[PDB]
Design a protein around this nucleic acid. Structure first.
Ligand SMILES: Nc1ncnc2c1ncn2[C@@H]1O[C@H](COP(=O)(O)OP(=O)(O)O)[C@@H](O)[C@H]1O
Ligand SMILES: Nc1ncnc2c1ncn2[C@@H]1O[C@H](COP(=O)(O)OP(=O)(O)O)[C@@H](O)[C@H]1O
Ligand code: BEF
Ligand code: BEF
Ligand SMILES: [Mg+2]
Ligand SMILES: [Mg+2]
Ligand SMILES: [Zn+2]
Ligand SMILES: [Zn+2]
Lengths: 369, 362, 343, 367, 369
DNA sequence: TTTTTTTTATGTACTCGTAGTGTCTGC
DNA sequence: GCAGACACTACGAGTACATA
């Protein structure tokens, strides 16, 4: 049988295992899908973890004696044994017969395995566009728009994120039929325009695998897949066939009324009013008057919540409604100093932006009470 | 060496290798050759009659490289790949194992993705009558507006367990239970395609005891080959069936009516060699006599439940005057009434049959 | 409100969509066709957000979430579907649907599906609120005498010819099950592109899958249709209907028969039917039965039914189905059952 | 050394030591010899006739070191743990303790992992008729196309509970209940191997007492050994069983058909002095009447265990009409029906005998 | 009723409100049961909550004008509305028309209330035995055995733990029938002999009570009621009848076989061994040789796990098989530097103790023979 | 058209919703 | 340090079904 010799450090191995053993859990579609493909070749090691729609490959350098091989191992067990060994412990791994022996100086573990031949090697392809972006930019792009994606909508193409690379900049769009989150960031280079839908699990994995470091992120987007490289992590994912609707027409074309307020102040006022809102469907009413904002919340057991805050406002008078969860989420994700609100009327969309920046925009509908 | 079981290695791979059931094969062939393909086919049958095999064959035909055709080529990489377990577009879901909605969502969300290789992403959901209610709701939501690139193939044993709304959106093909002649013909082909000698009487017994299903017939064929020293002889199959006979009722009532005391004794001894509750045996014998007396009144009394023993039963109904049947039922009823108080249940049922045998003849 | 038939639903949707559609009835096929037609026409007229939302008493009640909120992406009109319980809404569900209809967007389309609702659910506040704008369409299974016309219409829909023998065979095989009937017509269309269906083809392309309710069995016994009665009993055995329901459904009419036969020798049937509160469709039925069966067969049937019920609820036996077949033989037809099936 | 129960000490350890069940043993050995190994076996039959033991022997034959051998080659390494029950690969599943589907799912998840040491990971599912319906449906597909390195051995008492879609895809071996001679010979072997003296009539009574099983027979033999001073004697067996041997009840029936009440009551008094259950006397007499009826109908119906009285049997077979036999049997059967309600069980038996005497169709009591 | 006019500083309200809202939670059996009563008498405001087997009382001082009165408010809503307010903001609460108006700045909220007579009280008992003990003292006293008590079992009243007072020493015991834990320690007062069973919920609340190494906690023990005083915090609970088995008999009296090991090394070894143990029968077998302890673990998928640790042992091989969750829990609780195992026989139970302290001890029954 | 619908005492699973607990991380 | 964020485990209920 295959030899597949391993002799590695724990610290050089803990992080890639924690990254590749993320989505694996529960009961998978197939038993092999619940196993990491460990493949040692040349002087390097590939750890492959897949869910029939994504594939994360982690590369680990080898300097100790080793022999080539490939076998699939339970993921949770391997990660737990790797994390359970003492700090700095050496790990030796040998495939004997149809079992795998993991040895440290005073411990020997045996593990069931599966042949690497039966592992569903994901199909390869050719990227239609390249891309290079600093990690912090992608971090902000995901953090600005991940929360507004549709959860399990019937349309089955809103359950994702729209990547729109145009001219020089990149845009991320998310929606749920009642909210819209759009974020635009520069990249520094002119790029071909592409519209792509990334599934929610792909977006979550991309968020997790950022590592918060400084090395650039490489992206290769093809016809039906995307691939991302950070250090020694290569994550590929499929795409959604649906066509993401045009975000441009959603935003209020003619915002009649401008107002500005403290981000933290408005957020905490909304939070305080949210307690006394109906659990059947949580929402509040905004009364916008001359430099004044009033928040009114009602609950069917005759519970009333009232708030008044001094805001900057340019308009006559307004009465509108708002699902308090949506506004609370958008203010929480804003993470800025002051918020600017664009209002048109009680039956059209409302725009939310930074008072001093325009990279991120949000659109929300009033809720009729 | 590795002698693969006859239930697996002889699974059909083309529509021409499927026995009988032309009312479904012809319909599917016409649908595939023409443009009319429904969005979800629901296959039904009884106990190994060709549901999963036909569903697999349909999935093979839908994604063949030569195109959507009644006859898959069997040569292209897709035909070879679906032939084995491994393939990407064809998703074989053991619904009986992943009943929970949590597992069903992880595989019904794949519909939004494009098929990797073939024209259609085909979901072969086997044993669909087992899903949970919420999983059924999820699958119905998928079927309401299914993408044009996904075809659903559902195979089950009891269609009526399915909720009515999901069934309303599926074209249901009900597979007829195979006939004795078709069973015998396919069994002869299977034996001759391999190196197993046989005698036609043995195959007739196998077909009759197979209860109209090819899996039962093939399982019994493998058992006969094993106990037959590599040759299927009549005596071996007959002795095995005697070890496996369960219809002690009809044979015993035939003997009791014909008043063969030795045959009744032998059949009681055989029914004692097998662990049989005597109360159950006696009560179902009462039921058989009840059905006989009913058939005395109208030929339509014998419904579709007892089609396997129709002929014999009809004969027993025709050749016996009703008064004797009434008397036999009366004595059997009174014997069963006093049965638990007899020396032994075997003992008491024996003398009850003796009481019923002493009348009319002898 | 408008009360409508499945044939004229096309015209009603063509003239203009109303606030809400209440498609109700006992059959699956006509309900499904009406719902599909409504959904397709709404999509043609600009309804895209389609929601299926079962009402059944469970942990599922958040329909209000889909109506109070305007769609940010597009001004897409929404369609909400409700699957009423097997017996209709209860009081709590009545008031919950009243709250649901208390507020409805003009661009929101409401679809409700379920079995027929009696006056108890018809006079509830929810239905009275819906009484103004909503259109209710009744989809009921045609009777065994009405099936051949419907099958002929369906054949003409698919450009098929069946003569008369094939129509009778299909009506008998799929009696009371229109869904399987339409599926079988489609299957026959697929089997023969010629479209000229005849007996030597529909005979082997058909199934025995049929549906029934105890009223059909009781009426089959009353008319003395022996083969139909035994067919219904066998189909109910396969369906797994509770034997006690059959017992009670027969017992009601059998007690009525016993009382009417007792009173017949002194009072004319015209006054007796009025005094005994008999439905107008069953009068002749009863007449035939009364003019066919004497009090001896009725007493024997009562003894048989008593033995059946007692052995069902005391000995926990499984001989119920054969015993009801025996009662079928002993009821209007050929009374023999000599002690054998007479206790 | 030590004294462990016979039912566990003398479990067969090879196909040679399994008594009876010739068809199943022959089929299994022949199939293993030919190499044709089905992937699902179902051993049905009455309790204690060796389905679990045969299944474990099949596991031995499959996992033996020398290869797929019909006869397990004595005790090899891979068979030692089977004998000790601690085998790495023979997965014993007390299905009655794992009826839930959330455990059959765990069983099916790890089915593909290669066996640790043996050629096959034989899943022995004891009492397969106890799994919940969901677990059945779960294991359907894994039975239809199992991996090449796993086998299922299912043992149950009544196959009818199992869904027919499981009976379809598995071999059905049915183990008939063993004959009286088989049980008696096996018991003679066991008592010889234990260096214990025994009486042939005692072992014949042991064979008759157990209904065609063996572990029941072994249990009753162990109880006999306890009742005796470590010896199986005829008196001890008669005491433990409560039977009448084959002589006293025959004297009763002979006197009763002779219409001699005096001897009937004298033997009733003697049986009371014997300290025996009265319902036991009635059931023994009914059994004797039925045996008389059997020999009258079928000329050759007596087994060897009654040979000691066989001659007298034939006497009644040539002297009493079948109608009188039926009359006596029904009279004493109603006596059995009424006995628990008589003022005294002895009193009730006396009344039943006197009732059979008064309605004697040949020599009735004078009026 | 009357008009509250209670002005309360947030800093003097948030923590006591959280303290009193601790025991309540989840969906209550009946309404009103989930609520809290605030009562002001002569400048002192008491927040009291209950579960009808527990009670919380918190006293705070008031300097602003008011009136003596008691009113009830739903707990969670008041806790969430008081929090999140600007720091240092006063809260003015006032009763009108069967509802409570709470004001902070320009923030107004209205809450449905219930009459104070609708808030039930608990029983009364006098001549409670008094205890004066340090907080962290009883904290670690219970913590050594908090895991030990069995939850949701019919046997005895294992849903709780026993306090025994003897001489000048307080001892605490818990068990499940397979594992038992004792911790005895001298208090420093003349004390009678008592043995009581405090319920598990009361134990959790008692742990929640402890805060700071300041003024010592005061216990008031009785027969059917328990009380705890921590500053201006008063807690009361209802006790459980019955009595646990004699812990003295449970402890082995023949610790002939001794083993000394390191706490952290043994804990890590057991954690590593537990990975491959049976999921339900988390049992490992132990081979004890001179200065050597070997642990073996198995599971239905095989996957044998072996480990070896250096100890201080002299004797024969014992091969003790027992559960891993229990030993892992006790080794987590010890947090000492060395651990003494004490073995008697291959059938006997095992004893676990601190090597350098006798205050706490544990016993665990073996698994298989 | 039409409205029409039944035994039960006890036990065994299965599946989803929702609370209670642990822990573990980037807060 | 701390929620809070899952993550998981347990429990209730709605429902199906078995047996007698
Ligand atoms: N129409 C058929 N032609 C040939 N073999 C058949 C047919 N139907 C059933 N079989 C036999 O039975 C075995 C199992 O068949 P399968 O199609 O799985 O039945 P099911 O409908 O119950 O899933 C097949 O391997 C094949 O040997
Ligand atoms: N055919 C047999 N040959 C020898 N001993 C048997 C046989 N059947 C049963 N036994 C005895 O019964 C004991 C248990 O038998 P077992 O195979 O467990 O019966 P079961 O089928 O009920 O599980 C065995 O140890 C053996 O002594
Ligand atoms: F695989 Be079949 F439905 F028995
Ligand atoms: F497995 Be047997 F019934 F003792
Ligand atoms: Mg199948
Ligand atoms: Mg067994
Ligand atoms: Zn092909
Ligand atoms: Zn061997």
């Amino acid at each position: 049988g295959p030899h597949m010799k391993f002799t590695v450090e724990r610290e050089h191995l803990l992080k890639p295992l924690q990254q590749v053993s993320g989505p694996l859990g529960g009961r998978p579609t197939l038993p092999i899908l619940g196993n990491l493909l460990l493949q040692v070749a040349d002087g390097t090691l590939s750890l492959t973890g897949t869910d029939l729609e994504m594939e994360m490959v982690a590369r680990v350098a080898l300097v100790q004696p080793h022999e080539p091989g490939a076998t699939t191992v339970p993921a949770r067990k391997f990660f737990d044994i790797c994390r359970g060994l003492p700090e700095g412990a050496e790990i030796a791994v040998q495939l004997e017969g149809e079992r795998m022996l993991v040895r440290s100086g005073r411990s020997r573990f045996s593990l069931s395995t599966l042949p690497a031949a039966d592992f569903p090697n994901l199909d390869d392809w050719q990227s239609e566009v390249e891309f290079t972006l600093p990690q912090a930019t992608m971090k902000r792009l995901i953090e600005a728009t991940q929360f507004s994606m549709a959860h399990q909508d019937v349309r089955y193409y809103l359950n994702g994120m729209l990547f729109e690379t145009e001219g020089e900049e990149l845009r991320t769009v998310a929606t749920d039929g009642h909210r819209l989150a759009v974020c635009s960031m520069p990249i520094g280079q002119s790029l071909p325009s592409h519209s792509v839908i990334v599934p929610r699990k792909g977006v979550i994995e991309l968020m997790r695998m950022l590592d918060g470091g400084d090395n650039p992120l490489r992206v290769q987007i093809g016809s039906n897949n995307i691939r991302a490289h950070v250090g020694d992590f290569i994550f590929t994912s499929k795409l959604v066939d649906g066509r993401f609707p045009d975000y441009r027409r959603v935003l209020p074309k003619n915002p009649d009324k401008h107002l500005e307020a403290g981000c933290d102040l408005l957020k905490q006022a909304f939070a305080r009013a949210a307690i006394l809102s109906n659990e059947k469907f949580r929402g509040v009413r905004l009364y916008v008057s001359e430099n004044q904002l009033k928040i009114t919340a009602n609950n069917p057991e005759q519970e009333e919540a009232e708030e008044i805050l001094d805001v900057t406002y340019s308009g006559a008078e307004m009465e509108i409604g708002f699902n308090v969860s949506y506004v609370l989420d958008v203010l929480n994700a804003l993470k800025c100093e002051n918020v600017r609100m664009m209002l048109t009327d009680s039956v059209s969309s409302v725009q939310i932006e930074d008072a001093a920046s325009q990279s991120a925009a949000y659109v929300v509908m009033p809720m009729r009470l | 060496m590795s002698y693969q079981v006859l239930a697996r290695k002889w699974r059909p791979q083309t529509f021409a290798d499927v026995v009988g059931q032309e009312h479904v094969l012809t319909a599917l062939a016409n649908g595939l050759s023409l443009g009319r393909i429904h969005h979800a086919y629901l296959f039904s049958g009884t106990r190994g009659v060709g549901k999963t095999s036909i569903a697999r064959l349909l999935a093979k035909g839908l994604n063949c490289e030569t195109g959507i055709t009644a006859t898959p080529c069997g040569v292209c990489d897709n035909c070879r790949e679906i032939e084995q377990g491994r393939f990407v577009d064809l998703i074989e879901i053991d619904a009986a194992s992943r009943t929970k909605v949590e597992d069903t969502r992880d595989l019904l969300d794949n519909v939004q993705y494009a098929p990797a290789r073939g024209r259609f992403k085909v979901y072969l959901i086997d044993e669909v009558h087992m899903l949970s209610r919420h999983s059924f709701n999820a699958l119905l939501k998928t079927l309401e507006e299914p993408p044009e690139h996904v075809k659903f193939l559902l195979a089950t044993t009891d269609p009526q367990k399915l909720p009515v709304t999901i069934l309303s959106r599926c074209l249901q093909f009900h597979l007829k239970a195979l006939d004795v002649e078709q069973i015998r013909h396919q069994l002869e082909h299977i034996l001759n395609e391999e190196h197993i000698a046989h005698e036609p009487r043995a195959l007739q017994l196998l077909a009759r005891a197979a209860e109209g299903s090819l899996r039962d017939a093939l399982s019994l064929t493998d058992q006969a080959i094993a106990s037959g020293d590599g040759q299927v002889s009549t005596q071996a199959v007959s002795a095995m069936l005697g070890t496996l006979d369960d219809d002690q009722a009809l044979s015993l009532v035939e003997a009791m009516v014909e008043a063969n005391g030795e045959r009744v004794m032998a059949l009681i001894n055989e029914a004692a060699a097998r662990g049989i509750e005597w109360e159950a045996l006696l009560v179902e014998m009462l039921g058989l006599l009840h059905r006989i007396a009913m058939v005395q009144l109208s030929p339509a009394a014998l419904g579709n439940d007892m089609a396997a023993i129709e002929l014999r039963m009809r004969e027993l109904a025709r050749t016996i005057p009703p008064t004797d049947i009434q008397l036999y039922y009366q004595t059997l009823l009174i014997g069963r009434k006093e049965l638990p108080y007899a020396p032994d249940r075997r003992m008491g049922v024996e003398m009850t049959l003796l009481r019923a045998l002493a009348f009319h003849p002898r | 409100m408008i009360r409508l038939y499945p044939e004229q639903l096309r015209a009603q949707l063509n003239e203009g969509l109303r606030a809400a559609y209440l498609l109700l009835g006992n059959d699956p096929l006509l309900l499904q066709e009406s719902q599909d037609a409504v959904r397709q026409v709404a999509a043609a007229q600009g309804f895209e957000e389609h929601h299926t939302f079962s009402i059944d008493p469970n942990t599922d009640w958040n329909a209000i979430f889909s109506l109070c909120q305007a769609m940010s992406l597009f001004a897409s009109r929404q369609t909400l579907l409700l699957l009423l319980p097997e017996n209709g809404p209860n009081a709590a569900i009545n008031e919950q649907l009243l709250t649901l209809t208390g507020l409805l967007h003009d661009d929101l389309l409401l679809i409700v599906r379920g079995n027929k609702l009696s006056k108890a659910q018809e006079n509830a506040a929810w239905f009275t609120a819906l009484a103004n704008r909503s259109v209710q369409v009744t989809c009921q299974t045609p009777e065994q005498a009405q099936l051949p016309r419907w099958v002929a219409a369906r054949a003409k829909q698919l450009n098929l010819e069946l003569d008369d023998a094939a129509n009778q065979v299909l009506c008998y095989c799929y009696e009371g099950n229109l869904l399987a009937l339409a599926q079988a017509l489609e299957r026959l269309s697929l089997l023969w592109p010629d479209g000229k269906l005849t007996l030597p083809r529909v005979e082997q392309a058909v199934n025995d899958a049929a549906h029934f309710t105890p009223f059909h069995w009781v009426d089959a016994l009353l008319m003395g249709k022996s083969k139909r009665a035994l067919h219904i009993l066998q189909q109910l055995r396969l369906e797994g209907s509770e034997p006690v329901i059959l017992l009670r459904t027969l017992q009601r009419e059998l007690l009525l028969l016993v009382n009417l036969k007792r009173q017949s020798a002194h009072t004319p049937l015209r006054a007796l039917f009025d005094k005994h509160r008999v439905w107008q469709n069953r009068r002749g039925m009863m007449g035939e039965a009364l003019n066919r069966l004497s009090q001896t067969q009725l007493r024997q049937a009562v003894q048989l039914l008593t033995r059946t019920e007692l052995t069902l609820k005391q000995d926990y036996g499984q001989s119920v189905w054969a015993e009801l077949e025996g009662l079928s033989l002993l009821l209007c037809h050929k009374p023999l059952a000599d002690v054998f099936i007479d206790g």
